[PDB]
Structure formats: structure tokens, C-alpha cells
Design a protein around this ligand. Structure first.
Ligand code: 582
Length: 268
């Protein structure tokens, strides 16, 4: 009915490319991922299955020849990456809250049989109230279908975030890989640095971690409570690695640290 409601002005480059689009009539904002098909099909397919408060909402897609347009939730708070101060990290209570939200999103995805495969701060966006949303399902895949798990073998992800089994084994379970990358994200949040270029014994920093030399860099900056959680996540053997239901029982995970968003108040 309302004449111009389907018109969106592309106002600014967010990061093919991602454009911030604003509705001509309502002024509602959305992100438009523009992909020059000249993976997308899978990405759209996967997005249509998604509906969760810690996952970037998918509004739809439009053809237009060789260009694919994916309409996605706009996250005005930007990337989590930008909230991490180099060599420092961020306040522990903030890191805990983002970690809780990240686990909520991951539990949701795993519950529907989807693995993201590329969790890292660049792919974790923040809304207007600093709620974290998992983004970019370009590398995502179905690991469970009709209640049967399929083992993965494709090497996907980003080296500093990738689990060591993906470098050492032909096949591996999907879920522990996403848990591992969440561990590296937690490290980045608390220390403002990545612990190693990749989880290989040829990597001095990685061997040092396996030898428990936590008086070294990023580890010494942590705090014993979140560090004990990291000791459970960053375990080389994915079969021994902590699972999400057990992360949710962790002492640090459950430690009261952060006050809720401060609301207006006065005194009489
Ligand atoms: C360029 C990376 N990027 C996105 O991909 C995206 C999406 C999708 N929604 N909101 C954003 C977004 C918002 C602020 C800054 C970067 C962003």
C-alpha cells in the first residue's frame, strides 16, 4: 500500500561488501551484504534456518542478475574486535557478559546442527545495547541432520582461532572446534593479544601453553578464575576438551562481576 516503503538508500560502507541501508520512508536501518556471484546458496540456506537474539537476523535476499543482496540485521555497536584494546583487552565484567552471549548463540547454533567454523572478534557484532550477535555464515555448515552427526574434514577458519585437531587429524567433531575458537576469543578479550599464530607444536607459544608456563604473556595478564576456564577450553585433545554444558557450570562463568545497564535515577 504505502508507495515508497520498499526503497532503501545505501548510505555507507560497513566493511563483496556490506552496506548500511536506510529505508526511504521509515528510516529503519539494515545491513546489505552485496555478493558478486561472478557458498552463497549455502549461506542463504543456512541464514533462513536462523532465529536467535545472539545471531545476526536474516531478513531476506534478492537476485538482480549476478549480484546477490542479503538483507541482515544492522548492528550499530560495530565489531567486538574494536572493543578490544591492544595488549590490554577490556574490563573482566564486560568480557564475561560478551562471553555469556557468545555461549548463548553457539548453544543455539549447535542445537540446530549448525557449526559456524569461523568464530573470531571480526565476526561478533554488537547492537545498540552492546548485545553480541554472531555474524557471517559464509563458512558455516550442517554437522547434524536427522539426529546423525557428520564428522568434518574440510579445513576452514582462521589460523590463530582454529583448534589443533583441524591441523593434525583427517576428521574431527564439529562442536569442540567452535568451543576452542570461543576460548581464543575469551583470551583476546582478557589480554588484548592472541596467544599463538597457530596451535602447532612447532609454535613456541603453543608448546609453552601446553607446558603450563602461565607466567608468560597473555596468560599472566588474566586472573586465576577465567584462566582456570581457559585451561579447560584450550585442551589439545578435543575429546577431553570442556563442553558447553560444562562451561555453563564453570566457577568464573558463574561469578558475579557486572552490574546491569545503568538506568536513570534521582534522589530526594
Ligand atoms: C562490515 C562488518 N559489519 C557487518 O557485517 C554488519 C552486519 C551484517 N550488520 N551490522 C554490521 C556492521 C555494523 C557496524 C560496523 C561493521 C559491520
Amino acid at each position: 500500500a504505502v508507495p515508497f516503503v520498499e526503497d532503501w538508500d545505501l548510505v555507507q560502507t560497513l566493511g563483496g561488501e556490506v552496506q548500511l541501508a536506510v529505508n526511504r520512508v521509515t528510516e529503519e536501518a539494515v545491513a546489505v551484504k552485496i555478493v558478486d556471484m561472478k557458498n552463497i546458496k549455502k549461506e542463504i540456506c543456512i541464514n533462513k534456518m536462523l532465529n536467535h537474539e545472539n545471531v545476526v537476523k536474516f531478513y531476506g535476499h534478492r537476485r538482480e542478475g549476478n549480484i546477490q543482496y542479503l538483507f541482515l540485521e544492522y548492528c550499530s555497536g560495530g565489531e567486538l574486535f574494536d572493543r578490544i584494546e591492544p595488549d590490554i583487552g577490556m574490563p573482566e565484567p564486560d568480557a564475561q557478559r560478551f562471553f555469556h552471549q557468545l555461549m548463548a548463540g553457539v548453544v543455539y547454533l549447535h542445537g540446530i546442527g549448525i557449526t559456524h567454523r569461523d568464530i573470531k572478534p571480526e565476526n561478533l557484532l554488537l547492537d545498540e545495547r552492546d548485545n553480541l550477535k554472531i555474524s557471517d555464515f559464509g563458512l558455516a555448515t550442517v554437522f547434524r541432520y536427522n539426529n546423525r552427526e557428520r564428522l568434518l574434514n574440510k579445513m576452514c577458519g582462521t589460523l590463530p582461532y582454529v583448534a589443533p585437531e583441524l591441523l593434525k587429524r583427517r576428521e574431527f567433531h564439529a562442536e569442540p572446534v567452535d568451543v576452542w575458537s570461543c576460548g581464543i576469543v575469551l583470551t583476546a578479550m582478557l589480554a588484548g593479544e592472541l596467544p599463538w599464530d597457530q596451535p602447532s607444536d612447532s609454535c613456541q607459544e603453543y608448546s609453552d601453553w601446553k607446558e603450563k608456563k602461565t607466567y608468560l604473556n597473555p596468560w599472566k595478564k588474566i586472573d586465576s578464575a577465567p584462566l582456570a576456564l581457559l585451561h579447560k577450553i584450550l585442551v589439545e585433545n578435543p575429546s577431553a576438551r570442556i563442553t558447553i554444558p560444562d562451561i555453563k557450570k564453570d566457577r568464573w562463568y558463574n561469578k558475579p562481576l557486572k552490574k546491569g545497564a545503568k538506568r536513570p535515577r534521582v534522589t530526594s
